[PDB]
Homo-oligomer: A and B are copies of this chain.
Amino acid sequence: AAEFVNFCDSFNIPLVQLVDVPGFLPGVQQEYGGIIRHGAKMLYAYSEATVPKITVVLRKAYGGSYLAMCNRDLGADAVYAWPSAEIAVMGAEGAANVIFRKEIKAADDPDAMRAEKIEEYQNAFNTPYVAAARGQVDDVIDPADTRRKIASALEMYATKRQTRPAKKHGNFPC
């Protein structure tokens, strides 16, 4: 991803992201292989890129892997969420289990409470509407309009002129 992003940026080619990522691949070898410095390349490439960057979240958009797919914080000029978009810092189930660990354990009926808290977390953070509420996405869109949304964003950002701090070059992760 990083090499492609860097190249496109070098030659003024806009970048369009289609996101459906559940996170980074769990594995001792991913960690020992330096996923930290390798994954950082995507964050660096997108953060450094100044060509128009358009992102469409199709479905899953979890943690750092969603940031790596260039969200607004990484400079995406336009971000759209399909109704199935699930941008989240963590799944509702896992989040509810931790947040309400105590409440659930001590509850007379854990199952009812847990499911209760999960749906609560789910609706509080992980729907397209919350991502839109926070401005993380420009709009929640009908999947059928995706081409138009991207096309319109590309047309408006065809005149994008973005400044970067002066430097010989940043320090691209190795």
Contacts and interface: CB of A to CB of B under 8 A. Distances in A.
B6 A167 contact: no
Interface centre among A48, A50, A170, A172 (most CB of B within 10 A): A172
B171 A7 contact: yes
A149 interface: no
A169 interface: yes
A3 B168 contact: no
A174 B2 contact: yes
A41 interface: yes
Interface residues of A, number: 17
Nearest to A33: B33
Contacts of A10: 167-171
B174 A48 contact: no
Contacts of A168: 9-10, 50
Given A48-B169, A50-B168, A168-B50, A174 B9 contact: no
Nearest to A4: B174
Contact of A41 (B2, B50, B174): B174
Q: Nearest 9 pairs between A and B by C-beta? A: A3-B174, A172-B172, A2-B174, A7-B171, A10-B168, A169-B169, A6-B171, A10-B171, A41-B174
